[PDB]
Nucleic acid binder design. Structure first.
Lengths: 110, 220, 130, 352, 130
RNA sequence: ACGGAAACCUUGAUUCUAACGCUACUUCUAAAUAA
C-alpha cells in the first residue's frame, strides 16, 4: 500500500585505504526499514515457584529491552538491525495462569 | 563492573548540504544527477551510520594513533577498543554502536516553504586553456535539515578506568566531525554538520552521567 | 470518460512521442534539460502521494499544472531559421494538461506520474538527448 | 592539525553566479519603480479563487506573443487585478539596469537567476570561490603556469587536468593538494542586496561601450560576505596563507597583460586583495592567460562573434557608491558614466 | 507466434548473448551494474506472481516495461569516437520487448522471468563483467 | 495370543567481526561587421 516495489534494498558502501585513499566498492542487502515481523515466544511453567516464574519474566523483559537497545544480527555497529517490539503482550495459551500484572509490567517496561 | 548502556543522542543539523551518495536505484526516471542515499519507503535523505563511523574513525586515526595505520585493523588500543577490530580477539566487538540518522524536522522544513527535501546543485568545470565549461548536477540534502543521531556505548566489567577515555574519544570524534565534513564532495563546501542537544543518558543499568552531560555542553 | 487507464498509458507514450517533431537529420528536438523541472516535480509529488493524502496535495498539483503551462510556452529551439517549441508539442500530443485536469484522488495522480515516467523513458529510448 | 581561515569578501562590482534558470518576461512586473517577481504557485492559487485560471493558461501557453502579450503587467492590467501580493520578492529599480526603457517592446525579455538554496534565499557556493582561488594559485606559480599546462596530444589544445596531481593512485601515498583546501559556502544574505545589471562590452579598437541583451541578477556593490577556508596540510596551508600577495601578483599580471590597454577611468581601484567572482568577468580571469593566449582566440576565429586581439572589457552599469574608508572618500569607479567592472570583488583573509 | 516457448528460451538467451556487441579488446560493453534495476524488478515480480493473481500485477509489468525501455537508452559507452548503447542492443537482440508484450497469464510472466535469469547467467558465462 | 510390547535422531550454537560511495571540477566563454 505504501508503493514499495521490493522488500529488500541494496546498500552501496565503499572502503578507502588510509595511505592511498582508493575506494573499493561493495554492495550488501538489507531489509526495508519499516518492515514488521510476527514474534512469538512461548514460555513453559513446570515445578517453578512464583518467585522463579517472576524472575524468568524479569529476565525475558530485560532480554527484550537489551535487544531493543542493541542490534539484531548483521553489521549493527554501522546502523543495522535496530528493532523495536510493538504490541508486546503475554497471553496464557495453555493451563490457567494469571498474567494481569505481567501484562501491566510488559506494557510499562516494554 | 556492572553492565550499563549510555546513549549519546544528538541532532545533526546540516549547515551546508550533504551528499552521502549511493547508486541510482531510487533515481527518478529522467534525472541525470548523482543521487543521495534515501529511505526505500519515504525517500527522504538519510545519514547511514556507516559513513559516520568511517569518517569518525579516519579523523580519530590522525590524533589517537601516533603510528602509520596502513589498514583499519592496525589501529591503536584506544580506537580498536571502541570501533572494533577484526584481527584482535579482545576487540572483535566494539563498544560503540552507530545508528542510521533519519529526518526529523520535515514538518518544520515544510513550514519554512520547501518544495522538496533534496536539492539539485548545478556545478561546472572550466578549462584553463580553452575556457570551455562542462556542467553537471549533484543532489544534496537541503540546509537546516536535522537528523536523529543515536550512538550506544556499553559499559561492561572491562569498562573500569577506561570509561572517561572513551567519553573523551567520542567527544573529540564529534568535534573533529564538526571541524570536517561528513561524506560527499565536502572539499567544495558540502557535508558541514553541527551536533545539537548532545546528551548522554543511561538507557540500561545504573551509571551516573551527571558529570558527563555538563562536560558535553561545556565543549560540544 | 478518462484518457489514462492502467492498461494503456505505456502504449499512449508510444503514440505521444513517436509523433514529436524532428530536425531534418532525424534527431529529436526536445531534450531532457527542458523537461527537467517537470520530471522533478512529478517524481516528488508521486513520492509524497504515498504518505500524504490528497486533501492537501491539491496545491502541489496546481503548481505542477502551472509549471507545465509555463515550460511549454517558454522553451524554444531555433533550427535553420525556423523556431520550434518542443515542450508545448510534447504536452499537446501527450495530453498532459487534460490528464492533469482529471487528477482527483491518489490513484489517478499516481497513474499520471507513471505516465510521465513512461513518456520520458520512451523519449530516451528513441535517442533523446540530455 | 587544521588551520581555519576567515575570508571576508567585499564586492566592488556586481557579481552573478547563475544556476541555468531565467525569469522570462511573464514572471516579473515592473511597476512603482520596482521589479516584482511573484511566485507562480501562489499566483495561480490566488487566481483560481478569483476564477482567471483559463486566461492565465492562454497567457502562458501562448507561443508567439507579439510585443505586449509577453509582459505579465499587461495580463494584470487587462483583466483588472490589483492584488499584487503573491509571495515573491522585489528588486529596487536601479535606473541603469538596461538600455532603452524597461517599458515598451524589447526591454528585458530574460533575467538570469542568481543561485538560490532550497528556501529561496541567495548564497555564494563554496565551489565558485574555490574556482577563483584555484585560478589565482595556478596562475601565480611557475610550476603550474608553464608550457606543460596544455595537452597538444589531441585534435585541439586543452588543459592538462593532471598537472596538479589528484585522485587515488595505486600503491602511492595520497598527493591531493586541493582536497586540503576546503572552501565553505556563504550564508543566505537576503534578497535585498540584488540588482538587475546588464552586460556591456568595451572594445579597445572601437573605444565605445556596446550594450548587449544579457540581463543578470547580481549582488549589489559593497556587500560583505564571509567564507571559511579549512586547511589540513602544510603545503595548502602555506598556499592559502599566501592567498593575499598572490591575488595582488595575479592582478598585476592581469593589468599588465589585459587591463592596461583600456582607459584607466574604467578600470577600478583596489581597497583589499583583488579577486574575480562569478560570471561576466572575462575569460582571462578564468584562464592561465599566459598559456591560453592564442588558443582561446583561435577557438573563436571562425565564428561571427570573432575575438579580436585580446577581446573586449566587460563593464556593467550599477549605481555609483562611495566608501568612507579611514583615508578619505573613495569612489568605487573613476568614470561618470557609472561603469563597474563586472565580476570584481576584494577580500581579506585572516586566521581565526 | 509465441516468441518464448518452454523449450527454446534458454537457447534464445544463448544466441542473444553470443551475438552482443563488443569492442576491440574482446570485452562485453554491457555490465551487470547497468541492468541491476531490471534484474531486481524481474525477481520481485517473479516472487510476487507465486501467491498473487495477474489481474493486480499489471502495474508491475507496466513499470517493468517502462524501466526496460528507459535503461535501454539511458546508459551509453563512448568507444572509438562513437557511442554504443549496450542495454539497447541487448533488448533488441534478445527480443525483450516482444516477450513483455506477450505476457498475458502467470505462466508467460514466469517464463519471461526465467528467460531473463538465463540471459544474465549466460552473459556472466561469456566474460560479462560487473 | 503378530520376533511381538514400551523408545522424539533429541539436547545446546547470532552467517558474526573490520570497512567514509570516496577523489580533482567557478553554470561558464565568445561581441565581429554594419549603422
Amino acid at each position: 500500500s505504501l508503493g514499495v516495489r521490493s522488500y529488500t534494498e541494496v546498500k552501496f558502501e565503499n572502503t578507502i585505504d588510509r595511505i592511498t585513499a582508493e575506494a573499493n566498492p561493495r554492495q550488501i542487502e538489507r531489509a526495508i526499514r519499516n518492515s514488521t515481523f510476527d514474534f512469538e515466544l512461548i514460555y513453559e511453567i513446570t515445578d517453578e515457584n512464583e518467585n522463579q516464574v517472576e524472575e524468568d519474566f524479569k529476565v525475558i523483559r530485560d532480554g527484550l529491552k537489551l535487544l531493543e537497545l542493541d542490534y539484531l544480527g548483521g553489521s549493527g555497529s554501522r546502523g543495522y538491525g535496530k528493532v523495536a517490539f510493538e504490541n508486546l503482550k503475554a497471553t496464557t495459551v495453555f493451563g490457567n495462569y494469571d498474567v494481569k500484572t505481567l501484562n501491566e509490567l510488559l506494557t510499562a517496561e516494554v | 563492573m556492572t553492565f550499563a548502556k549510555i546513549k549519546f543522542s544528538a541532532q545533526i543539523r546540516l549547515e551546508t548540504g550533504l551528499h552521502i551518495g549511493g547508486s541510482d536505484a531510487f533515481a527518478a526516471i529522467g534525472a541525470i544527477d548523482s543521487p543521495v542515499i534515501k529511505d526505500p519507503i519515504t525517500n527522504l535523505p538519510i545519514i547511514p551510520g556507516s559513513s559516520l563511523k568511517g569518517k569518525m574513525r579516519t579523523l580519530l586515526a590522525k590524533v589517537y594513533n601516533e603510528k602509520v595505520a596502513e589498514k583499519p585493523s592496525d589501529d591503536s588500543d584506544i580506537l580498536s577498543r571502541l570501533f572494533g577490530n577484526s584481527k584482535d580477539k579482545r576487540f572483535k566487538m566494539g563498544r560503540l554502536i552507530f545508528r542510521d540518522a533519519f529526518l526529523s524536522n520535515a514538518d518544520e522544513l515544510d513550514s519554512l516553504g520547501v518544495r522538496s527535501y533534496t536539492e539539485v546543485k548545478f556545478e561546472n568545470t572550466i578549462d584553463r586553456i580553452t575556457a570551455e565549461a562542462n556542467p553537471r548536477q549533484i543532489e544534496r540534502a537541503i540546509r537546516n535539515s536535522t537528523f536523529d543521531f543515536e550512538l550506544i556505548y556499553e559499559i561492561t566489567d572491562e569498562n573500569e578506568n577506561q570509561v572517561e577515555e572513551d567519553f573523551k574519544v567520542i567527544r573529540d570524534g564529534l568535534k573533529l566531525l564538526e571541524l570536517d565534513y561528513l561524506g560527499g564532495s565536502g572539499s567544495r563546501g558540502y557535508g558541514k554538520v553541527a551536533f545539537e542537544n548532545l546528551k548522554a543518558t543511561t538507557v540500561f543499568g545504573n551509571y551516573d552521567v551527571k558529570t558527563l552531560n555538563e562536560l558535553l555542553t561545556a565543549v560540544v | 470518460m478518462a484518457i489514462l487507464t492502467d492498461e494503456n498509458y505505456v502504449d499512449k507514450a508510444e503514440r505521444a512521442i513517436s509523433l514529436l517533431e524532428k530536425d531534418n537529420k532525424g534527431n529529436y528536438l526536445l531534450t531532457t534539460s527542458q523537461i527537467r523541472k517537470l520530471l522533478s516535480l512529478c517524481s516528488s509529488l508521486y513520492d509524497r502521494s504515498k504518505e500524504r493524502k490528497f486533501d492537501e496535495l491539491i496545491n502541489d498539483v496546481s503548481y505542477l499544472r502551472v509549471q507545465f503551462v509555463y515550460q511549454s510556452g517558454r522553451n524554444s529551439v531555433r533550427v535553420n531559421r525556423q523556431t520550434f517549441f518542443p515542450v508545448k508539442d510534447l504536452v499537446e500530443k501527450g495530453q498532459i494538461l487534460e490528464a492533469l485536469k482529471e487528477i482527483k484522488d491518489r490513484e489517478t495522480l499516481q497513474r499520471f506520474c507513471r505516465y510521465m515516467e513512461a513518456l520520458v523513458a520512451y523519449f530516451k529510448f528513441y535517442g533523446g538527448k540530455d | 592539525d587544521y588551520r581555519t581561515f576567515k575570508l571576508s569578501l567585499l564586492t566592488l562590482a556586481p557579481i552573478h553566479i547563475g544556476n541555468g534558470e531565467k525569469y522570462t518576461s511573464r514572471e516579473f512586473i515592473y511597476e512603482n519603480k520596482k521589479f516584482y517577481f511573484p511566485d507562480m504557485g501562489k499566483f495561480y492559487n490566488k487566481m483560481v479563487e478569483k476564477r482567471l485560471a483559463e486566461k492565465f493558461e492562454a497567457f502562458l501557453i501562448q507561443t508567439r506573443p507579439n510585443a505586449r502579450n509577453n509582459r505579465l503587467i499587461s495580463f494584470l492590467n487587462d483583466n483588472r487585478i490589483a492584488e499584487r501580493s503573491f509571495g515573491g520578492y522585489s528588486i529596487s529599480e536601479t535606473g541603469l539596469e538596461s538600455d532603452r526603457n524597461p517599458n515598451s517592446a524589447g526591454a528585458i525579455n530574460e533575467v538570469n537567476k542568481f543561485i538560490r538554496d532550497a528556501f529561496g534565499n541567495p548564497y555564494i557556493p563554496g565551489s565558485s570561490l574555490k574556482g577563483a582561488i584555484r585560478t589565482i594559485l595556478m596562475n601565480t606559480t611557475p610550476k603550474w603556469n608553464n608550457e606543460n599546462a596544455v595537452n597538444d596530444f589531441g585534435r585541439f589544445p586543452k588543459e592538462n587536468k593532471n598537472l596538479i596531481p589528484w585522485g587515488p593512485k595505486k600503491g602511492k601515498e595520497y598527493d591531493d593538494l586541493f582536497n586540503a583546501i576546503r572552501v565553505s559556502d556563504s550564508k543566505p544574505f537576503d534578497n535585498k542586496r540584488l540588482i538587475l545589471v546588464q552586460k556591456w562590452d568595451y572594445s579597445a579598437k572601437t573605444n565605445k561601450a556596446k550594450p548587449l541583451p544579457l540581463y543578470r541578477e547580481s549582488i549589489s556593490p559593497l556587500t560583505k560576505i564571509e567564507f571559511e577556508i579549512t586547511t589540513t596540510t602544510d603545503e595548502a596551508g602555506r598556499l592559502i596563507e599566501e592567498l593575499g600577495k598572490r591575488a595582488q601578483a595575479f592582478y598585476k599580471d592581469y593589468k599588465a597583460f589585459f587591463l592596461s590597454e583600456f582607459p584607466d577611468d574604467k578600470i577600478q581601484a583596489n581597497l583589499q586583495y583583488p579577486i574575480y567572482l562569478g560570471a561576466g568577468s572575462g575569460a582571462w580571469t578564468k584562464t592561465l592567460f599566459k598559456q591560453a593566449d592564442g588558443i582561446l582566440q583561435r577557438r573563436y576565429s571562425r565564428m561571427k562573434t570573432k575575438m579580436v586581439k585580446k577581446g573586449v572589457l566587460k563593464l556593467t552599469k550599477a549605481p555609483l557608491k562611495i566608501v568612507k574608508i579611514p583615508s578619505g572618500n573613495h569612489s568605487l569607479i573613476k568614470n561618470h558614466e557609472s561603469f563597474y567592472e563586472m565580476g570584481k570583488a576584494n577580500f581579506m583573509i585572516k586566521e581565526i
